[PDB]
Design a protein around this ligand. Structure first.
Ligand SMILES: NC(=O)c1nc(F)cn([C@@H]2O[C@H](COP(=O)(O)O)[C@@H](O)[C@H]2O)c1=O
Length: 192
């Protein structure tokens, strides 16, 4: 319900324990969530979603720089639907930097302070959909948060800036499949 909780100590296996590209060896300090681990968690997230909404849904995929999460999640949802009825499913998008009388499912990669999603919920509520639930792979424990909690959470992680899987850093760490903590060497290196 609160998701897979990663404690402040000791979170994230060491870098040497998982395959990491040599060119990112110094730009990361610790790995929080290995790729296959995100996969298995997302799979169950597809089930949790499907059993929370049994009426043709609209996958409203929050769209910024990445696609991985909502691509994987929707793949697993498509795997579930692959047994039962000819179930339709519309996937929509919202770019950040129609749904009225529909069962909507907002998909986001990570929530830090919450404002982003909170504001996103307001805009959507105005169109008066039948119901709106939110799914977020990551929800960061931080005093900078406004209190908003998603309906579906993949993992809860320490207040660190992570990259990988679906998260980037100035168009970098795209080929990094692991959600890891970026080090100070990386921040300065890939600074805009
Ligand atoms: N490590 C992070 O918290 C993070 N990493 C990224 F690569 C991108 N973000 C982006 O920061 C934005 C801020 O979200 P927020 O309004 O603070 O909940 C989010 O849209 C999120 O996608 C991160 O928060």
């Amino acid at each position: 319900s609160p998701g897979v909780v990663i404690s402040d100590d000791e979170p994230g296996y060491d870098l040497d324990l998982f395959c990491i590209p040599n060119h990112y060896a110094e730009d990361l300090e610790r790995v929080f969530i290995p790729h296959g681990l995100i996969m298995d968690r997302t799979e169950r997230l597809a089930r949790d979603v499907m059993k929370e909404m049994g009426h043709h849904i609209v996958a409203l995929c929050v769209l910024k720089g990445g696609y991985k999460f909502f691509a994987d999640l929707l793949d697993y949802i498509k795997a579930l639907n692959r047994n039962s009825d000819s179930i339709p499913m519309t996937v929509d998008f919202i770019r950040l930097k129609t749904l009225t009388g529909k069962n909507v499912l907002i998909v986001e990669d990570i929530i830090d302070t919450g404002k982003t999603m909170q504001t996103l919920l307001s805009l959507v509520r105005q169109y008066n959909p039948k119901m709106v639930k939110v799914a977020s792979l990551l929800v960061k424990r931080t005093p900078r948060s406004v209190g908003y909690k998603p309906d579906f959470v993949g993992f809860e992680i320490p207040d660190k800036f992570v990259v990988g899987y679906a998260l980037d850093y100035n168009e970098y760490f795209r080929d990094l499949n692991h959600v890891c903590v970026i080090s100070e060497t990386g921040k300065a290196k890939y600074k805009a």
